[PDB]
């Protein structure tokens, strides 16, 4: 019957509410999982939760799938993932006037804005940055803009979304560094949920093959900036 999906509806263009937060859930990952669910003959139900609680919610069995999850070996050990459906690259973003920060290594004893309970937040911790925890990507950039923090590490997808939405507020940023590799992103389910995993994968390959994915992708991304994943065949 239902596909229970955990998400946080304040992260454009992944997952957000239409009409400036007033309307239904929308976004790339939302449109895709809605699509997956329709083909599997399921009604989708979304549960809204802060990012810091999303994995906790999946562990607690409040829902069955998470969207927009970076594949890591730690997570691979402990959860099931679909085939990757997108890829992002991590950027170090500073204000355009910033001088002292040129690499990830320079973040030590700088104030950095990150989201509580994320890998980037943990990376910031290991670097011995001074963390300021923001509720989302919009607030990270806003903290940076108003000089409350000196840097943020942010995937390319939300950062470019921000420049698209607020362009004349965009040239106030510079990219100081980027990870050498881009990162596979997939749906995450609990381990030992193999049937649902195979099903999503089946359907994702169908969505590659019939042009639906290109439509959902073009709806949200500039294929000149945002990387995708290899297709499926027949």
Residue 115 sits in the site that holds ligand KG2 (CB under 6 A):
yes
Footprint of a copy of itself on 66-105 (CB under 8 A): 70-74, 76-77, 80-81, 83-84, 87, 90
User: What tokens does 46 get?
Assistant: 């979304």
- Stated as kind and residue range, the H or E segment containing 20 is helix 18-21
> Could you tell which of a copy of itself, ligand KG2, none binds residue 14, using a CB distance below 5 to 8 A set by kind?
ligand KG2
Classified as helix, coil or strand, 30 is helix
Residue 153 sits in the site that holds ligand KG2 (CB under 6 A):
no
Residue 3 sits in the site that holds ligand KG2 (CB under 6 A):
no
Footprint of a copy of itself on 10-49 (CB under 8 A): none
Question: DSSP letters of 117-136?
Answer: TSHHHHHHHHHT-EEEEESS
User: Which residue of 98, 118, 227, 228 would you call a contact of ligand KG2, by CB under 6 A?
Assistant: 118
Residue 182 sits in the site that holds a copy of itself (CB under 8 A):
yes
Q: Find out whether 25 and 85 touch, Cβ atoms under 8 Å.
A: no
Give the binding-site size for ligand KG2 (rule: CB under 6 A). 17
Residue 205 sits in the site that holds a copy of itself (CB under 8 A):
yes
Residue 152 sits in the site that holds ligand KG2 (CB under 6 A):
no
| Cα–Cα distance measured from residue 42 to residue 226, given in angstroms and rounded to the nearest whole number | 30
User: Judged by CB under 8 A, which stretch of 4-12, 28-36, 194-202, 215-223 contacts a copy of itself?
Assistant: 194-202
Footprint of ligand KG2 on 30-69 (CB under 6 A): 51, 54-55, 66, 68-69
> Could you tell which of a copy of itself, ligand KG2, none binds residue 196, using a CB distance below 5 to 8 A set by kind?
none
| Cα–Cα distance measured from residue 139 to residue 118, given in angstroms and rounded to the nearest whole number | 15
Residue with tokens 């355009």: 96
Residue 156 sits in the site that holds ligand KG2 (CB under 6 A):
no
Question: Which of 17, 20, 14 lies closest to 32, judged by CA?
Answer: 14
User: What letter would DSSP give residue 151?
Assistant: B
| Cα–Cα distance measured from residue 72 to residue 132, given in angstroms and rounded to the nearest whole number | 24
């Amino acid at each position: 019957s239902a596909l229970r999906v955990g998400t946080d509806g304040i992260y454009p263009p992944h997952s957000f509410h239409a009409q400036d937060g007033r309307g239904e859930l929308t976004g790339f990952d939302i449109d895709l999982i809605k699509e997956v669910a329709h083909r599997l003959n399921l009604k989708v139900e979304f549960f809204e939760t802060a990012v810091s609680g999303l994995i906790t919610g999946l562990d607690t069995n409040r829902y069955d799938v998470l969207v927009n999850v970076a594949i890591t070996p730690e997570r691979q050990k402990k959860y099931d993932f679909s085939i990757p459906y997108i890829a992002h690259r991590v950027l170090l973003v500073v204000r355009s006037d910033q001088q002292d920060i040129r690499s990830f290594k320079d973040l030590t004893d700088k104030t950095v804005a990150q989201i509580l309970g994320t890998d980037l937040s943990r990376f910031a911790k290991e670097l011995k940055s001074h963390l300021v925890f923001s509720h989302n990507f919009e607030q990270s950039l806003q903290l940076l803009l108003s000089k409350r923090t000196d840097a943020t590490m942010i995937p390319d997808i939300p950062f470019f979304n921000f420049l698209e939405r607020r362009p004349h507020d965009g040239n106030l940023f510079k990219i100081a560094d980027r990870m050498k590799d881009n990162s596979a992103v997939a749906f995450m389910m609990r381990k030992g949920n193999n049937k649902l995993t195979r099903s999503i994968n089946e359907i994702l390959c169908a969505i590659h093959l019939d042009g639906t994915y290109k439509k959902i992708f073009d709806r949200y991304f500039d294929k000149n900036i945002i990387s995708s994943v290899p297709g499926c065949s027949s």
